[PDB]
UniProtKB/Swiss-Prot annotation, chain A:
Notes on the domains: The PX domain mediates interaction with phosphatidylinositol 3,4-bisphosphate and other anionic phospholipids. In the autoinhibited, unphosphorylated state an intramolecular interaction with the C-terminal SH3 domain precludes phospholipid binding and interaction with CYBA. Phosphorylation disrupts the autoinhibited state.
Post-translational modification: Phosphorylated by PRKCD; phosphorylation induces activation of NCF1, leading to assembly and activation of the NADPH oxidase complex.
Disulfide bonds: none
Gene of this entry: NCF1
Record: disease: Granulomatous disease, chronic, autosomal recessive, 1: A form of chronic granulomatous disease, a primary immunodeficiency characterized by severe recurrent bacterial and fungal infections, along with manifestations of chronic granulomatous inflammation. It results from an impaired ability of phagocytes to mount a burst of reactive oxygen species in response to pathogens.
Subcellular location: Cytoplasm, Cytosol; Membrane
Role this protein plays: Subunit of the phagocyte NADPH oxidase complex that mediates the transfer of electrons from cytosolic NADPH to O2 to produce the superoxide anion (O2(-)). In the activated complex, electrons are first transferred from NADPH to flavin adenine dinucleotide (FAD) and subsequently transferred via two heme molecules to molecular oxygen, producing superoxide through an outer-sphere reaction.
Record-given protein name: Neutrophil cytosol factor 1
Record's subunit section: Component of the phagocyte NADPH oxidase complex composed of an obligatory core heterodimer formed by the membrane proteins CYBA and CYBB and the cytosolic regulatory subunits NCF1/p47-phox, NCF2/p67-phox, NCF4/p40-phox and the small GTPase RAC1 or RAC2. Part of a cytosolic complex composed at least by NCF1, NCF2 and NCF4. Interacts (via C-terminus) with NCF2 (via the C-terminal SH3 domain). Interacts with NCF4. Interacts with CYBB. Interacts (via the second SH3 domain) with CYBA; interaction is phosphorylation-dependent. Interacts with NOXA1. Interacts with ADAM15. Interacts with TRAF4.
Shown stretch of the complete protein: 359 to 390 of 390
Tissue and organ expression note: Detected in peripheral blood monocytes and neutrophils (at protein level).
Curated annotation (Swiss-Prot), chain B:
Organism: Homo sapiens
Annotated protein name in UniProt: Neutrophil cytosol factor 2
Protein's gene: NCF2
Cysteines joined through disulfide linkages: none
Family: Belongs to the NCF2/NOXA1 family.
Entire-sequence positions represented here: 455 to 516 of 526
Record's subunit section: Component of the phagocyte NADPH oxidase complex composed of an obligatory core heterodimer formed by the membrane proteins CYBA and CYBB and the cytosolic regulatory subunits NCF1/p47-phox, NCF2/p67-phox, NCF4/p40-phox and the small GTPase RAC1 or RAC2. Part of a cytosolic complex composed at least by NCF1, NCF2 and NCF4. Interacts with NCF4. Interacts (via the C-terminal SH3 domain) with NCF1 (via C-terminus). Interacts with SYTL1 and RAC1. May interact with NOXO1. Interacts with S100A8 and calprotectin (S100A8/9). Interacts with GBP7 (via GB1/RHD3-type G domain).
Annotated function: Subunit of the phagocyte NADPH oxidase complex that mediates the transfer of electrons from cytosolic NADPH to O2 to produce the superoxide anion (O2(-)). In the activated complex, electrons are first transferred from NADPH to flavin adenine dinucleotide (FAD) and subsequently transferred via two heme molecules to molecular oxygen, producing superoxide through an outer-sphere reaction.
Domain remarks in the Swiss-Prot or TrEMBL record: The OPR/PB1 domain mediates the association with NCF4/p40-PHOX.
Transmembrane parts of this sequence: none
Length: 32, 62
């Protein structure tokens, strides 16, 4: 039993769009 | 051919509420496609592309 880490505000879709595949980008594709 | 980004074993079952957020269970072998912002990275596991926070994957062997 372990208490997972309170997930933080995931990277700005854009930087993700800058460091991810077009696939994941489709999930965001919001940028800014 | 086939390309690869990186790898990082999981440790906690991350509750995925958003799309891009790649959901994974405790102790898992996800396919890290790349680094996304240090605190997160690209995650493609099971014909599905998303992302996850490295905090849930101290990694084991890249």
């Amino acid at each position: 039993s372990k208490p997972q880490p309170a997930v933080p505000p995931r990277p700005s879709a854009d930087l993700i769009l800058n460091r991810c595949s077009e696939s994941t980008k489709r999930k965001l594709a919001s940028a800014v | 051919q086939l390309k690869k980004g990186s790898q990082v074993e999981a440790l906690f079952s991350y509750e995925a509420t958003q799309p891009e957020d790649l959901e994974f269970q405790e102790g898992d072998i996800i396919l890290v496609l790349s680094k996304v912002n240090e605190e997160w990275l690209e995650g493609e596991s099971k014909g599905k592309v998303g992302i996850f926070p490295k905090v849930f994957v101290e990694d084991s062997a890249t």
